[PDB]
Amino acid sequence: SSMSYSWTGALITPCGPEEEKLPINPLSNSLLRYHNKVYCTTSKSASQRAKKVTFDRTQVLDAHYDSVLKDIKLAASKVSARLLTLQQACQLTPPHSARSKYGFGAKEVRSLSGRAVNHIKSVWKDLLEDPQTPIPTTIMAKNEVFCVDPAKGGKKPARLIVYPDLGVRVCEKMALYDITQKLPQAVMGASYGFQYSPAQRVEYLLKAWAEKKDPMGFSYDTRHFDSTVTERDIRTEESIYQACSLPEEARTAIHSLTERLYVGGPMFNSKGQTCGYRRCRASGVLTTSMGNTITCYVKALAACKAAGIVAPTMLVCGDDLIVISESQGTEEDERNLRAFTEAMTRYSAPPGDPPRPEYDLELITSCSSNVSVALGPRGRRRYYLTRDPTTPLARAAWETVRHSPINSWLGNIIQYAPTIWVRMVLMTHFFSILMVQDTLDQNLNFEMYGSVYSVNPLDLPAIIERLHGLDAFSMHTYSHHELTRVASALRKLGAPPLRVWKSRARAVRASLISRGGKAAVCGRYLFNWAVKTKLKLTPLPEARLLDLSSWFTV
Numbered sequence: 443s444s445m446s447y448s449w450t451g452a453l454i455t456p457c458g459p460e461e462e463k464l465p466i467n468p469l470s471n472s473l474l475r476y477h478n479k480v481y482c483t484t485s486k487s488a489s490q491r492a493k494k495v496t497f498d499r500t501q502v503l504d505a506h507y508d509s510v511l512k513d514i515k516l517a518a519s520k521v522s523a524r525l526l527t528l529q530q531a532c533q534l535t536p537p538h539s540a541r542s543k544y545g546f547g548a549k550e551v552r553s554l555s556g557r558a559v560n561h562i563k564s565v566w567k568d569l570l571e572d573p574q575t576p577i578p579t580t581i582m583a584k585n586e587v588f589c590v591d592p593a594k595g596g597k598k599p600a601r602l603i604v605y606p607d608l609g610v611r612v613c614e615k616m617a618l619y620d621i622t623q624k625l626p627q628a629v630m631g632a633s634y635g636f637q638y639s640p641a642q643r644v645e646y647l648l649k650a651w652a653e654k655k656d657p658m659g660f661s662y663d664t665r666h667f668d669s670t671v672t673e674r675d676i677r678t679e680e681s682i683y684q685a686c687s688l689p690e691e692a693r694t695a696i697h698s699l700t701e702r703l704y705v706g707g708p709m710f711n712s713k714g715q716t717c718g719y720r721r722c723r724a725s726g727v728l729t730t731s732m733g734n735t736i737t738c739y740v741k742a743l744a745a746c747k748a749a750g751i752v753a754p755t756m757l758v759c760g761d762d763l764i765v766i767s768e769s770q771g772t773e774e775d776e777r778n779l780r781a782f783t784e785a786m787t788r789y790s791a792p793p794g795d796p797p798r799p800e801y802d803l804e805l806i807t808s809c810s811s812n813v814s815v816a817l818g819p820r821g822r823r824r825y826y827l828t829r830d831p832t833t834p835l836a837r838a839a840w841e842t843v844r845h846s847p848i849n850s851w852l853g854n855i856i857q858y859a860p861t862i863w864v865r866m867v868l869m870t871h872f873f874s875i876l877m878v879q880d881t882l883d884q885n886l887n888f889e890m891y892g893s894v895y896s897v898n899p900l901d902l903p904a905i906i907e908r909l910h911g912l913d914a915f916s917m918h919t920y921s922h923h924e925l926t927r928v929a930s931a932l933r934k935l936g937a938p939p940l941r942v943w944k945s946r947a948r949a950v951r952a953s954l955i956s957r958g959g960k961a962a963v964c965g966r967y968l969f970n971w972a973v974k975t976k977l978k979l980t981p982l983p984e985a986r987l988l989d990l991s992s993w994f995t996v
């Protein structure tokens with residue numbers, strides 16, 4: 443049937459400046475040496491990604507899909523959702539959100555400036571009066587940092603991002619924000635990812651594994667997921683939304699947004715030249731994350747029925763997917779997974795790498811993370827969530843006139859506190875830098891799922907205990923897999939071995955213990971691993987006061 447994109451041949455031009463690296467990276471050049479391997483994706487590679495995501499889609503559904511969609515619309519029916527006030531949608535736009543063509547930006551929108559509320563009023567009225575005229579969109583290449591992989595063809599091309607004008611984006615939040623806060627949870631229940639903190643997600647998968655008599659799990663990621671969603675997928679999304687109890691005014695704007703924006707439309711480059719036509723998901727609309735996860739859940743759930751997966755348990759984060767199920771014998775389990783893949787290829791959610799049955803929780807990698815195990819001095823098994831540290835290290839090295847890696851470090855220290863690589867590398871380099879800057883007690887921004895939370899470095903012990911528990915300061919023996927990987931990534935980026943980090947840490951700890959106060963608590967908790975006569979860590983009362991609920995949610 444339809445083509446994901448078509449192109450006029452106009453270039454995908456840069457939105458602002460794409461910065462050169464500098465000849466000295468003074469904050470991260472004592473972290474790793476091979477700064478030549480750290481690169482940022484750029485609009486240069488945008489045509490390359492363009493050719494990789496343009497393809498003819500052929501969707502073929504069936505009674506399994508049809509059965510799922512029916513039950514998911516019924517779950518949807520139990521949701522009641524309201525319009526947001528224009529004023530509320532305004533106050534939800536980020537403080538740096540891309541300006542409007544109509545001469546005003548995030549600052550006026552957040553401050554309810556009259557100019558802005560006026561234009562946005564008339565944009566809302568156009569949505570309610572006009573259900574057909576396509577809404578134009580800007581296409582830009584995403585800039586993100588990676589390490590090179592010669593085994594994966596040098597550098598990844600930039601991801602394609604496609605978003606409507608700032609006026610339209612506020613309007614989306616009025617029509618759809620409340621649903622984005624209620625629908626996913628309701629139709630997916632505990633299967634919704636994006637409601638679990640790292641430890642909660644380990645808890646969940648651990649539980650799923652043990653419920654099964656003979657457990658078996660696999661993970662799935664659709665290849666170029668935004669380009670695989672078809673105009674029918676998007677219209678089916680509208681009907682899942684319309685399944686809820688909504689005011690009539692919202693249904694009207696929801697329908698207009700779907701027909702005029704979500705099912706597709708013309709894309710213009712940043713220079714204003716008309717650039718192509720889009721017939722798939724624009725990664726940029728409000729519903730990007732919700733549509734990804736619900737359309738992924740429905741297809742994946744259908745495919746489970748097609749493949750005869752027994753007693754499935756799912757975890758769905760966008761297009762990343764984990765399924766813990768009852769094993770039917772390894773021979774059947776392989777056949778079933780080909781069936782699952784053939785099904786989802788029929789649903790137009792074809793895979794990146796072919797999925798594969800695994801019978802060991804550490805061998806299932808999804809959401810770029812995996813569960814792993816460490817002992818204590820206890821001998822007791824502590825389970826946690828880790829990842830390949832390559833990309834975290836690469837972004838620990840991204841350092842230009844306009845970006846500081848220091849937020850990147852904090853973010854990983856918070857999210858992966860129990861990992862050997864956070865504990866021995868990032869935590870050490872973090873506090874070492876801040877002390878030399880005399881910055882320990884000056885706040886940083888932690889960033890996750892759009893929200894930005896303020897964090898004081900000297901609070902990391904309490905924060906980490908509230909998130910991961912006191913076991914995060916006691917992991918004695920890490921797994922052969924984890925040791926191998928962290929070792930290899932450190933070699934790959936020219937960072938010191940773990941041996942050397944242990945020495946550095948001993949010194950860091952000594953140095954902030956002897957600042958007393960909150961700084962010393964940091965050294966006794968965060969660096970208990972570096973001294974041979976470990977002190978007995980006690981729970982921290984201030985952790986009992988922290989409420990980190992909304993940190994790892996949506």
Ligand SMILES: Cc1cc2nc3c(=O)[nH]c(=O)nc-3n(C[C@H](O)[C@H](O)[C@H](O)COP(=O)(O)OP(=O)(O)OC[C@H]3O[C@@H](n4cnc5c(N)ncnc54)[C@H](O)[C@@H]3O)c2cc1C
Nearest residue numbers: 730731734759760761762808809810811889890891892996
């Ligand atoms: C709803 C949502 C909104 C986000 N908004 C921002 C933002 O405004 N500014 C910012 O700097 N980072 C944003 N991010 C990125 C986010 O903060 C994490 O960095 C990201 O999820 C990578 O963490 P991960 O463990 O899930 O790794 P990953 O394996 O990279 O993510 C797993 C899945 O989450 C989804 N996803 C990944 N990145 C994004 C993304 N940028 N936007 C939407 N979905 C994504 C995808 O479906 C992906 O398959 C957002 C992520 C989500 C899920």
Ligand SMILES: Nc1ccn([C@@H]2O[C@H](COP(=O)(O)OP(=O)(O)O)[C@@H](O)[C@H]2O)c(=O)n1
Nearest residue numbers: 663664665666667668669725726730760761
């Ligand atoms: N920076 C990002 C990353 C992913 N996503 C969404 O998540 C989907 C799948 O995530 P992904 O990491 O597997 O990237 P793809 O190569 O599948 O496009 C995208 O296709 C996007 O719709 C986004 O909106 N912004």
Ligand SMILES: [Mn+2]
Nearest residue numbers: 664665666667
């Ligand atoms: Mn994908």
Ligand SMILES: [Mn+2]
Nearest residue numbers: 663664761762
């Ligand atoms: Mn993915």
